[PDB]
Amino acid sequence: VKKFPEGFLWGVATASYQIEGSPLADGAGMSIWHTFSHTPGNVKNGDTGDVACDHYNRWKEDIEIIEKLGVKAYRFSISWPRILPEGTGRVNQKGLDFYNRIIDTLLEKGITPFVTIYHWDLPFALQLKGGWANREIADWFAEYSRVLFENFGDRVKNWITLNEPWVVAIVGHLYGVHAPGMRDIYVAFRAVHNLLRAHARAVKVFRETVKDGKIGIVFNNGYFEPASEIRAVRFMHQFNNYPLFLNPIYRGDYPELVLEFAREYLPENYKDDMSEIQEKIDFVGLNYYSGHLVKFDPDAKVSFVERDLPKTAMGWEIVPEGIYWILKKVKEEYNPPEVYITENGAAFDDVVSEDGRVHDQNRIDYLKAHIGQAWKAIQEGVPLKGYFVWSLLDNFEWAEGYSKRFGIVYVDYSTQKRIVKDSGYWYSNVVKNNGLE
Ligand SMILES: CO[C@H](O)c1c[n+]2c([nH]1)[C@H](O)[C@@H](O)[C@H](O)[C@H]2CO
């Protein structure tokens, strides 16, 4: 058997725009994902977050699912424009009420809330002012965060400033594939920098406002391997994984190969902000899904090489030892006091059999394998305090729309019926047992 430490936090994870629907209900401001998805060509099948999982109405049912599964922590995000419709200034009490009900319900049922402050749904009003491109976002984000701390910090004690700032900056402002849908390398790296400054200002406000909680930040990570017998792998790690942000946070500068590729794109006096950026954090959240074979390619001088390996419906290579690797490497490089796996999961072509069940043995195999590799890292001293399945529900998968299903619970979108998948039942047993058998 593989048993986890006593008090280890088994969770599931969602994000506001992906599950809620009703983006304009009860006085909410538009977000950049509302305007991005309502722009033709941006999202597969013209899908939007207008309805999604209707979690905005069905929130109590979904929490009852969490409870019934015996899952101990719930990671969810707050929609900034439900709280502050113009991004700053006015506070919307109905936005606060919505999350207050979710928070109290969780606590009442003994589920630990993990709140992601920003999971990509920036108020549109602030995008008009430059969004992440604008240095003033450090103030806007701090003011938003202060509101959340004041209203919920009595109850929520576990906070995440940002989900995947690399994706926010690069995918949103260089690749143009995510909101706000831009393609400018100089903008993209000013967003990287400003995300760091906004994060640190929010951590600083947290210390003034919530004297009894913990705060961290979440990063996407891939397991990169070299196609042969390696610097391209070093680059991909420093650029795509946690070092892009953790080197500034812990060592007060960007990683070396990031500076080689991108120095010219960063502000000229960016080191002036580095000492504020080193605001002390309580934990690092690492998201992990996939491995990649990498080679130098002259024609960022890196290309991916396809491998004949099992893949998910995203076409992502299933590489479980990656989660062990990234856990080891974070300890070795930055030694944060706590680590959580804040997302791990897989998309498969889920079908409801005529027995009424969803026989996702592919997902069970995926999760089991990665949970085992996370166990290993704990045995070798990684201070891993928790693990979160992405996702509780099938949901709006950004530019893929509804076509990719990551849930341990199946959502039939024509009825909004929730059907717990085999993987959900399987995970419930793991949580009950506090590990694998
Ligand atoms: C780029 O990092 C990860 O591949 C990643 C995967 N995922 C994520 N990040 C995001 O945090 C979620 O909002 C996605 O729904 C989820 C599934 O795609």
* Domain regions of the chain by residue span: 1-437
Q: Calculate the alpha carbon distances from 304 to 220, 232, 280 in Å.
A: 17, 10, 35
| Tokens at 208, concatenated | 């003034």
| Tokens at 119, concatenated | 């999971």
Ligand 1 centroid to Cα of residue 399, in Å, is 11
Sign of CA dihedral 391, 43, 189, 202: negative
Beta strand pairing status for 435-436 and 2-3? antiparallel
Which residues neighbour 185 within 8 Å (Cβ) at sequence distance 6 or greater? 174, 262, 265
- Residue 158 CB–ligand 1 contact under 6 Å: no
Residue given tokens 């113009």 in the structure block: 86
- How far apart (Å, rounded) are the C-alpha atoms in residues 110 and 96? 21
CA atoms within 13 A on the CB side of 281: 30
Residue whose CA is at the smallest distance from ligand 1 atom 18: 397
Residue given tokens 């989900």 in the structure block: 163
Q: Is 307 exposed, middle or buried (0-12, 13-18, 19+ CB in 10 A)?
A: middle
The residues annotated with a catalytic role in the active site are: 164, 343
| Tokens at 296, concatenated | 């130098």
DSSP 331-389: HHHH--S-EEEEEE---------TTS----HHHHHHHHHHHHHHHHHHHTT--EEEEEE
Give the determination technique.
Answer: X-ray
Residue whose CA is at the smallest distance from ligand 1 atom 15: 397
Beta strand pairing status for 302-305 and 283-296? antiparallel
- Residue 288 CB–ligand 1 contact under 6 Å: no
Angle at 41 between CA 36 and CA 47, to 5 degrees: 65
For the CA of 220, the closest atom of ligand 1 is 2
Residue 226 bridge partners (DSSP) = 294
For the CA of 395, the closest atom of ligand 1 is 15
Residue given tokens 């680590």 in the structure block: 339
Ligand 1 centroid to Cα of residue 245, in Å, is 18
For the CA of 164, the closest atom of ligand 1 is 11
Type of residue at 432 = K
- How far apart (Å, rounded) are the C-alpha atoms in residues 360 and 368? 12
Q: Is 261 exposed, middle or buried (0-12, 13-18, 19+ CB in 10 A)?
A: middle
Residue 418 bridge partners (DSSP) = 411
- Residue 98 CB–ligand 1 contact under 6 Å: no
Element (H, E) at 66: helix 55-69
- How far apart (Å, rounded) are the C-alpha atoms in residues 222 and 166? 12
Residue given tokens 């590799």 in the structure block: 373
CA atoms within 13 A on the CB side of 219: 26
Q: What is the resolution of this structure in A?
A: 2.2
Ligand 1 centroid to Cα of residue 348, in Å, is 14
- How far apart (Å, rounded) are the C-alpha atoms in residues 118 and 148? 11
- Residue 164 CB–ligand 1 contact under 6 Å: yes
Q: Which SS3 state, helix, strand or coil, does residue 50 take?
A: coil
DSSP 294-342: EEE-----EEEE--SS-B-TT--B--THHHHHHHHHHHHHH--S-EEEE
Q: Calculate the alpha carbon distances from 63 to 68, 70, 162, 393, 410 in Å.
A: 8, 11, 23, 11, 15
Domain 1-437 classification at class level: alpha beta
- How far apart (Å, rounded) are the C-alpha atoms in residues 177 and 157? 34
| Tokens at 99, concatenated | 């999350």
